Design an enzyme around this catalytic site. Structure first.
Site, mmCIF file in Angstrom:
data_model
loop_
_atom_site.group_PDB
_atom_site.id
_atom_site.type_symbol
_atom_site.label_atom_id
_atom_site.label_comp_id
_atom_site.label_asym_id
_atom_site.label_seq_id
_atom_site.Cartn_x
_atom_site.Cartn_y
_atom_site.Cartn_z
ATOM 1 N N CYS F 138 -2.193 -4.738 -2.417
ATOM 2 C CA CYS F 138 -0.973 -3.910 -2.279
ATOM 3 C C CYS F 138 0.001 -4.328 -3.375
ATOM 4 O O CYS F 138 0.726 -3.509 -3.910
ATOM 5 C CB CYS F 138 -0.304 -4.191 -0.909
ATOM 6 N N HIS F 142 2.935 -2.516 -5.605
ATOM 7 C CA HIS F 142 4.196 -2.651 -4.888
ATOM 8 C C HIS F 142 4.837 -4.045 -5.061
ATOM 9 O O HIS F 142 5.702 -4.457 -4.289
ATOM 10 C CB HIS F 142 3.973 -2.388 -3.412
ATOM 11 N N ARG F 187 -0.390 6.061 6.557
ATOM 12 C CA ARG F 187 -0.032 5.598 5.201
ATOM 13 C C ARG F 187 -0.897 4.405 4.810
ATOM 14 O O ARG F 187 -1.341 4.288 3.642
ATOM 15 C CB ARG F 187 1.456 5.242 5.090
ATOM 16 N N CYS F 191 -3.460 4.236 1.621
ATOM 17 C CA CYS F 191 -3.307 3.152 0.654
ATOM 18 C C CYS F 191 -4.646 2.473 0.444
ATOM 19 O O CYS F 191 -5.148 2.376 -0.681
ATOM 20 C CB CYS F 191 -2.308 2.221 1.314
HETATM 21 C C1 HEC Z 1 -2.058 -2.308 0.428
HETATM 22 C C2 HEC Z 1 -2.911 -2.136 1.736
HETATM 23 C C3 HEC Z 1 -0.864 -1.306 0.348
HETATM 24 C C4 HEC Z 1 0.078 -1.049 1.255
HETATM 25 C C5 HEC Z 1 0.330 -1.726 2.615
HETATM 26 C C6 HEC Z 1 0.955 -0.003 0.732
HETATM 27 N N1 HEC Z 1 0.468 0.370 -0.474
HETATM 28 FE FE1 HEC Z 1 1.009 2.025 -1.512
HETATM 29 N N2 HEC Z 1 1.570 3.644 -2.662
HETATM 30 C C7 HEC Z 1 1.126 4.014 -3.928
HETATM 31 C C8 HEC Z 1 1.710 5.307 -4.327
HETATM 32 C C9 HEC Z 1 1.489 6.113 -5.632
HETATM 33 C C10 HEC Z 1 2.573 5.703 -3.148
HETATM 34 C C11 HEC Z 1 3.440 6.978 -2.997
HETATM 35 C C12 HEC Z 1 4.813 6.669 -3.577
HETATM 36 C C13 HEC Z 1 5.681 7.909 -3.516
HETATM 37 O O1 HEC Z 1 5.366 8.913 -4.235
HETATM 38 O O2 HEC Z 1 6.670 7.866 -2.725
HETATM 39 C C14 HEC Z 1 2.443 4.614 -2.199
HETATM 40 C C15 HEC Z 1 3.098 4.587 -1.022
HETATM 41 C C16 HEC Z 1 3.111 3.579 -0.112
HETATM 42 C C17 HEC Z 1 4.049 3.517 0.979
HETATM 43 C C18 HEC Z 1 5.120 4.584 1.273
HETATM 44 C C19 HEC Z 1 6.346 4.386 0.394
HETATM 45 C C20 HEC Z 1 7.474 5.346 0.694
HETATM 46 O O3 HEC Z 1 8.541 5.199 0.050
HETATM 47 O O4 HEC Z 1 7.343 6.240 1.561
HETATM 48 C C21 HEC Z 1 3.811 2.389 1.656
HETATM 49 C C22 HEC Z 1 4.538 1.895 2.934
HETATM 50 C C23 HEC Z 1 2.687 1.723 0.988
HETATM 51 N N3 HEC Z 1 2.273 2.473 -0.092
HETATM 52 C C24 HEC Z 1 2.064 0.542 1.347
HETATM 53 C C25 HEC Z 1 0.274 3.274 -4.666
HETATM 54 C C26 HEC Z 1 -0.409 2.159 -4.217
HETATM 55 C C27 HEC Z 1 -1.422 1.492 -4.992
HETATM 56 C C28 HEC Z 1 -1.762 2.015 -6.430
HETATM 57 C C29 HEC Z 1 -3.114 1.748 -7.103
HETATM 58 C C30 HEC Z 1 -1.815 0.427 -4.295
HETATM 59 C C31 HEC Z 1 -2.955 -0.546 -4.658
HETATM 60 C C32 HEC Z 1 -1.178 0.499 -2.993
HETATM 61 N N4 HEC Z 1 -0.256 1.545 -2.983
HETATM 62 C C33 HEC Z 1 -1.362 -0.356 -1.935
HETATM 63 C C34 HEC Z 1 -0.655 -0.374 -0.755
#
Ligand code: HEC
Ligand code: HEC
Ligand code: HEC
Ligand code: HEC
Ligand code: HEC
Ligand code: HEC
EC number: 2.8.5.2
Lengths: 229, 180, 180, 229, 180, 229
Positions: F138, F142, F187, F191
């Site tokens: 994650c 993030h 979500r 992810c």
């Molecule tokens: C590892 C298991 C995790 C966890 C717990 C989370 N992420 Fe991601 N994430 C990515 C992208 C492009 C988004 C959308 C962003 C957007 O357009 O708003 C997200 C979104 C999330 C959220 C929601 C955020 C929000 O503001 O609503 C959460 C809670 C979350 N993730 C948790 C991209 C990635 C990755 C890119 C290769 C990776 C790896 C992860 N996320 C991994 C995780």
């Protein structure tokens, strides 16, 4: 032989002097050990107070007591907390007096509430926070052992230990080159000044947080106050 | 792991409310300050590579020679004034190099936060290439060592180009007491 | 969970009160040991730089050539004894290289704490320049990798100049089994 | 075929045998689960004891119990804590007996007090302390996964996980090559020997601190003791 | 230090119970993955050295020239499909370079997790030597930077040799938009 | 204007609707604020529950209430927890309704038990765990401030701050691209999907552990739910 006792003696008088709209002294102020109980109070601050729901250092606590017990407006004290030629500071004198009632007592702040734990953590973050035009943090100068800036030996303040115990057990202190007794509020102000930061607000949360962090590092240090530096 | 409460920002904003014109900038961190604070000056290999790259592009080299006047550099090194809220306007800022570094071997008042710089130029055979590397160091220390404790004098506007050329001369001129 | 590093020193001093003749010194740390301890062998870029610079200065090169006798070097590498409170007086100390490194490809008893050194000399075309670099590595591993867990054999007095020359010959001699 | 049960039997006798100037047994010794309560005791040690203000491992607690309950001077056992040819160890025997009363119990030490938190921090420092003439620390050999020294596989002890759980859940142990049951005190002495450090004093604070550090990493390990190695 | 509880492996093994054929390998960490997790991408100088060594040996270079088709490399860089439990069988896997990197200066949809790669070839004077270095970076990023966030495309089998050659031409070909 | 209120309305009906073998509604389910007490509950989850001895997030607790209080078989819900074409989800609807009862309330999870402390540490470990064929954790996406993947701005979730507060305060949310309201369960599933990992089991410990970690980083966020993204 120690001019800081001039402040101790003036603070004693202030402690017992009726002031404010309520026309009473500060003799019933609770500094954490019970209303009016002086001995050991300074050694156990900053701490959580239930009546405010805030963690408070001695100067913050004295301001609240003046406002609530005495009905004395604290805007003048806050405006001019540090003494200068021909103008004494009630805050410095009260701190001298109160700190001296802990002389010989070991520093001990218990992180017994979520609020104290959080305030401690905020102090730790502020300590390592690099900012402003020299990029300094407290830890730049106080994060390692046996260093100095020019010929001024630097205490290590980021770990519990002798340096922190010896630092915090010796404030408030008479500062010879200033011909004035100074408190931890003035030390923090002077620290921030040297980091090329704006002046912290007197009796602000930032200063309390930092004070709590340092005081916890100083646990076990035996107070010998007022000191002379 | 222990992590900083979000309330830290709010505590700063509300504890520093008398601000000299423009000194709000001083409360806000740039990205490098933020990374160095949270990693306690120990960034990951990836973070270190990014910081050095971002800082290097910010360095502005002189158009001509790099060495100024060593005598004026001695003054930059010794001067620990400037930039503080108690400093009246017009105060000239120094580099306070002596705060952290041994420089002239005869000067007994020097700090130990940084390495000894005694004979800095002589050690490097007075190399012009090394002089330029030194200019870069003083201009932005973090271009070459990520999360260095040394202030970024040029990029932060603490020292002018001429002051930096002067302090490089203090390090590199064979006539500098640093090299004697 | 934090502690006074002076408390830790105090704990050592009161937990180790049976000291052999000439062993009181063994409870001391030098500044490299202290920095590596507090950082759990992960120093900041700035600390790593200061470690390597302090250690590089301490390296003593032989007068003449750096290759000794590979057969004697084999013994230094295989010997895991010496310096222990249970060792009898007169016990020759070895490098115990095999504790951590593959060396002779035919020797099955080798450790994996360190990299394989199989064909070390042959890989480098038996370079005399690389032989000097290995002398330096064995004399003080921390001059080139801050907080390396390899012991600083030369600088701590564990191996004599001759011993290090001999183990260098074990790594670099074309007739060493290392290079067959 | 496990000779370690010979120690268990001898420790059972010792537990109930009147000794010392005060001529009583160890039956009322509190090992942290209440006076006399053996089951689970070893699984929850080292720990803070209110009656001494100290964090104590099993062997330190036994020495104190012997002092304050039996009035048996403990200097003879500290001088010779490890059995040898023609001489058994009371300590090895009591530890075997008490540890075996936790056979099948999961390891669980809690950093419930400031004293335990501080001890843990000491233990951690001791584990990473680069020491003596080879610069070795515990983490030189027990800091990585899947490594070995010559053909001896090394458990990783710097992080919680299977290695740490297996190691702490299998001491005390019969050491075949020494023809003797040995306790964690002996393992630590052995490790320090190989690090080119002097011999640690038996039941020293250093060994308690390291023991707590290791036992915390082994949380959840199921004790099967005495083992054989 | 903060430590991860041992129970984490059990939590993972009991939380991911619907497994596509062979996918339990996706839950199993290799040694590099494990170290980068435990150290939070900040290994010690010694650990970083070990990682880089272990990873460099795994790189398989092409027999002939490194550069493939930039046109096809563009497709590798743009494609972020492949490898997901939701992808149909036969889905071609992409490098998703644009997810993290600026590449073609005229392409506005690009991420910033990694450095801009605009004019990557041109600023290296289209060096054949540097193209081979880029091949290696794409094949296994951690061979040159320990615990890099960039996926190890070649070693993990995400990209074929041809796809890697093609994306390298996207970086290095003078007629690639990246260089125009 | 916000299609998430259709879920809120369906959730409200479900909360009061008799179901299962016991033929009672969900009205006596204890979500942490006392049996039946909805206001503020979402803002204080996940949390430890004495009756199960486990830390539970909202969806896990709802499944447990359905089983124990209603005698309603949850197996088909766990099989199909996310709505799709012509099929609404009782879980999304109940989560919408319950989270909306915390609208305007500040997020606060207290780590007041060893179980809560442990789950939080497990969440942190999961967040930094690199695995599978892209080597992602994650923290890859993030772990930093002010980054983006293509033109999607990424919130930093590894430390407390505005990003974490705003993200956790805005779930559950209507996802325009999906024409559905989705919960944190979805979500996390999404992810993991994009990290090339297998799908986590619905209502699994890993998901609760990560949720607890994230929600702690989001402390102080004022819930505005259901949101639209
Ligand atoms: C590892 C298991 C995790 C966890 C717990 C989370 N992420 Fe991601 N994430 C990515 C992208 C492009 C988004 C959308 C962003 C957007 O357009 O708003 C997200 C979104 C999330 C959220 C929601 C955020 C929000 O503001 O609503 C959460 C809670 C979350 N993730 C948790 C991209 C990635 C990755 C890119 C290769 C990776 C790896 C992860 N996320 C991994 C995780
Ligand atoms: C960041 C806001 C801080 C804080 C909280 C402290 N410092 Fe400093 N400090 C510096 C020097 C030269 C001194 C005098 C030392 C001496 O007289 O030998 C101090 C002093 C202190 C003290 C009092 C120490 C005592 O023993 O009386 C305290 C509590 C303190 N500091 C805290 C130098 C620096 C810096 C040099 C660039 C920086 C940055 C800081 N200090 C920052 C801070
Ligand atoms: C006043 C303008 C100066 C000048 C001329 C220099 N410094 Fe510093 N410095 C400091 C530390 C901790 C380091 C080591 C970490 C790093 O390399 O960034 C340095 C380094 C240097 C060098 C390079 C020395 C080398 O061995 O290669 C040089 C040439 C140099 N400095 C010059 C610390 C500090 C300070 C601490 C608050 C301050 C102030 C300065 N330095 C100031 C200056
Ligand atoms: C007994 C005298 C020897 C000799 C001849 C060598 N070693 Fe070690 N070593 C160890 C580790 C962890 C490393 C890698 C980290 C570092 O580079 O410091 C090394 C390194 C070397 C090298 C360099 C290899 C290379 O990358 O080119 C060489 C030539 C070398 N060693 C020789 C670990 C250990 C030990 C762990 C306790 C011990 C003992 C030794 N080394 C002993 C020796
Ligand atoms: C620093 C004081 C320590 C501490 C606390 C420990 N070690 Fe070591 N260790 C080493 C070897 C070769 C063994 C034998 C492993 C085996 O027989 O399987 C051990 C063993 C231990 C144990 C017991 C492990 C078990 O599974 O029973 C424990 C608790 C332990 N050690 C702790 C090797 C070394 C070293 C090589 C130079 C160093 C240094 C240390 N150990 C240091 C320590
Ligand atoms: C798709 C196949 C690609 C290609 C062709 C490249 N990347 Fe990445 N990359 C990322 C990060 C954080 C870095 C910097 C840290 C490091 O050096 O490892 C990089 C680095 C590169 C380089 C080197 C640039 C340079 O400094 O010279 C190159 C040539 C490169 N990448 C190409 C991060 C990511 C990703 C984040 C999840 C993804 C996806 C990619 N990279 C994909 C690619």
């Amino acid at each position: 032989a120690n001019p800081g006792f001039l402040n101790v003696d003036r603070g004693e008088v202030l402690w017992s002097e009726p002031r404010g709209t309520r026309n009473v002294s500060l003799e019933t102020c609770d500094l954490g050990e019970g209303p009016g109980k002086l001995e050991g109070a300074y050694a156990h601050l900053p701490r959580y107070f239930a009546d405010t729901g805030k963690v408070m250092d001695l100067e913050q606590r004295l301001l609240w007591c003046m406002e609530t017990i005495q009905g004395r407006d604290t805007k003048p004290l806050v405006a001019k907390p540090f003494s200068g030629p021909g103008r004494t500071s009630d805050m410095e004198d009260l701190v001298a007096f109160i700190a001296n009632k802990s002389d010989g007592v070991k520093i001990k702040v218990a992180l017994a509430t979520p609020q104290e734990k959080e305030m401690y953590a905020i102090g730790e973050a502020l300590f390592f926070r690099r900012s402003s035009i020299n990029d300094f943090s407290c830890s730049t100068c106080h994060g390692a052992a046996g260093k100095r800036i020019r010929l001024q030996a630097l205490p290590q303040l980021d770990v519990p230990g002798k340096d922190a115990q010896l630092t915090m057990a010796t404030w408030p202190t008479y500062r010879v080159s200033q011909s004035a007794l100074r408190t931890m509020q003035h030390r923090m102000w002077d620290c921030y000044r040297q980091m090329r930061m704006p002046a912290p607000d007197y009796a602000s949360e930032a200063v309390t947080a930092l004070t709590l962090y340092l005081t916890k590092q100083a646990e076990g240090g035996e107070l010998k106050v007022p000191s002379i530096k | 792991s222990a992590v900083d409460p979000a309330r830290v920002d709010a505590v700063v904003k509300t504890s520093f409310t008398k601000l000299p014109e423009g000194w709000e900038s001083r409360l806000q961190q740039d990205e490098t300050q933020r990374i160095c604070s949270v990693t306690r000056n120990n960034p990951s290999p990836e973070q270190a590579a990014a910081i050095m790259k971002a800082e290097e592009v910010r360095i502005k080299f002189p158009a001509g020679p790099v060495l100024g006047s060593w005598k004026d550099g001695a003054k930059v090194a010794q001067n620990g004034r400037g930039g503080q809220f108690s400093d009246p306007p017009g105060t000239v800022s120094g580099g306070n190099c002596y705060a952290c570094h041994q420089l002239d071997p005869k000067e007994v008042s020097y700090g130990t936060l940084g390495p000894s710089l005694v004979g800095y130029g002589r050690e490097r055979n007075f190399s012009a290439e090394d002089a330029k590397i030194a200019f870069a160091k003083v201009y932005d220390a973090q271009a070459s060592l990520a999360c260095s404790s040394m202030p970024r004098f040029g990029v932060n506007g603490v020292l002018t180009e001429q002051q930096i050329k002067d302090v490089v001369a203090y390090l590199f001129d064979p006539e500098s007491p640093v090299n004697k």
